[PDB]
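Input record (Table S2, row 539):
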Amino acid sequence: ADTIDATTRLVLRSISERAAVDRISESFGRSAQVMHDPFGGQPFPAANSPWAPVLAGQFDAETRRVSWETLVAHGPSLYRTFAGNPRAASTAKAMRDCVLRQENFIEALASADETLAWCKMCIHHNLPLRPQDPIIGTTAAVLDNLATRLRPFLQCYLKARGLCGLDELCSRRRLADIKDIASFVFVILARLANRVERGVAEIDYATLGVGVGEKMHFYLPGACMAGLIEILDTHRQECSSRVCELTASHIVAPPYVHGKYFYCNSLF
Amino acid sequence: ADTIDATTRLVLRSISERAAVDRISESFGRSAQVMHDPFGGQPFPAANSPWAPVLAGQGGPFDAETRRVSWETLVAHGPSLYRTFAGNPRAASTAKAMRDCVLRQENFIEALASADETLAWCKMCIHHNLPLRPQDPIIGTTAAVLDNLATRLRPFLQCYLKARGLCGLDELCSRRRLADIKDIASFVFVILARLANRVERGVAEIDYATLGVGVGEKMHFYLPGACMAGLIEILDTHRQECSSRVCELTASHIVAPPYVHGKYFYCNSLF
Ligand SMILES: [Zn+2]
Ligand SMILES: [Zn+2]
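Output record (zinc ion complex):
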């Protein structure tokens, strides 16, 4: 019969023996210490780089904003910085992974666009797509973030479109399944993340839906953000579910209104 | 061959034709307006309820210290809130929808607290021999705290679970077997996955066995606060058995989330 074994039950209760405010502050202190100088004195070289501000171990969207034209011109420089500094890149990748997994909804949308715009730029210049660089390497993080936030909404929305469920889209990972902006974002990110996870040497352009001799003309920078905000707004015109309208609305307008009832902690 | 069809490419490119700063302000306005009075005329009745503060469309952010209860207080006052949930299905569905959104956007410490809130609530129901109902706002949003914690801890747990000789995160949440529980991490994810599964299957009431509790038993193995205390602990101690620098970095940044590095640009050509 399936059950929690006796010894494990003791392990779980024994948590109380080592739980205390003091112990918590000491444990936090050790993690805080790690975050003080994570690059350990081997940051990205920033000499003569236009990306120096974001290469340092020192984020405001508007402050770090670039036009597409600027990304085309200076993109290769950042690409070369990533490729030429493996230790810093692994550091950066680890940190970026955590950032993307805790970003709010608007921030997550921007990270999705940062990812695809970065791929668009590489394809524009006929550069290989490098799974090991910090941006492509953390595709799964923004995918996971967006899936967690949008899953309830997409359960209804994707049904209205007559499309596969979110889980199905992300497991099938077929270009042929893309029929709207939601399926585009999740299928492409899922395809990209899957290639990264398998540890391929480089990522085929077809992964991004780009054929031989073509470029990523069907994606414009900002489309993830603009597109997903729009359907969160417009789906209510075709849907009679109040629960759905609340869900869509609260994603777009996140200030807390209701839903927490108590905090109970007997241990510290 | 596998390709993005031409019709869909038209749809995708047309996003630009409608994208504008104004349009975004208008859309945000419509969502903000819904959130002005989400219970829309049918709030929880709160007369002579000790839970009145958290039953209204509150005016400001949830305060963990103000809304703190001892286990003894939860046992005493729990049945009242339970009765309010069960007695007001329309208000409860509204509450459940909002809580689901909250839990899916909470930060790591908040997520831990919501896991304990969920399990302590279950333990209180079991204490009183009350049915576990999927329509209950707290039980009903189990999947939300599950998804959030999984998103945040997945890279850490890949290494940690392997060191403990346990199943992977995905396997744990797929198999959903009590026999796979051998530590706090597997406990939290297996139990939440089991509970979330019963919720989505729309059962009348959820068997206590779902939470690993047999006939007449009281969930002795769970102490309120164990999710938060336990998971904070392993994020601290795993580095002692693991030689990986980047794993230590991952664990530390989860515990200490202020931004340091990792974002490179913002590019939006549409608005
Ligand atoms: Zn809907
Ligand atoms: Zn490790």
